[PDB]
Copies of this chain bind each other. A is one copy, B any other.
Amino acid sequence: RRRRLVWTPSQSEALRACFERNPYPGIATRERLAQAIGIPEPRVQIWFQNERSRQLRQHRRESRPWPGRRGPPEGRRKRTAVTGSQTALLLRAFEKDRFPGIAAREELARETGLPESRIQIWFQNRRARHP
């Protein structure tokens, strides 16, 4: 294959500069840049491709639609204590059916005083950890 080039500091700076003017340059701009900084234009296009590539992937990763968040997370749910009597009953259900529908689910709530919400999270976690 071909012999990897090495950019001088002022070569890199010039590229970096033009990339912020527009990152989709036509052959004119590229050709002018190639002469100005002293390197063949095909090399310059391939640098523009990979800078685009790099910046696009790094943005998909880290950027978000909404204006970040200034401060600390809001209050999480305080950890329910599930009683030995509750636990026992939930297990019995889990041994028979591991995917209760809302009918069986809302039934296990009445029997344990837990909210159906938490019944579901219990079976979710239970499945993840005892296949």
Which residues from chain A sit less than 8 Å from chain B, CB to CB?
A: 1-3, 20, 22-29, 40-42, 55-56, 58-60, 63-66, 69, 73-77, 101-103, 115-117
Contact = CB atoms under 8 A, between A and B. Distances in A.
Contacts of A59: 63-65
Number of copies: 2
A65 B73 contact: no
Decide if the interface of chain A is mainly helix, strand, loop or mixed.
loop
The residue among A24, A25, A65, A76 with the most chain B CB atoms within 10 A of its own CB is A65
Given A63-B65, A65-B55, A75 B117 contact: no
Q: A41, A63, A73, A74: which has the most chain B beta carbons within 10 Å?
A: A74
Nearest to A73: B24
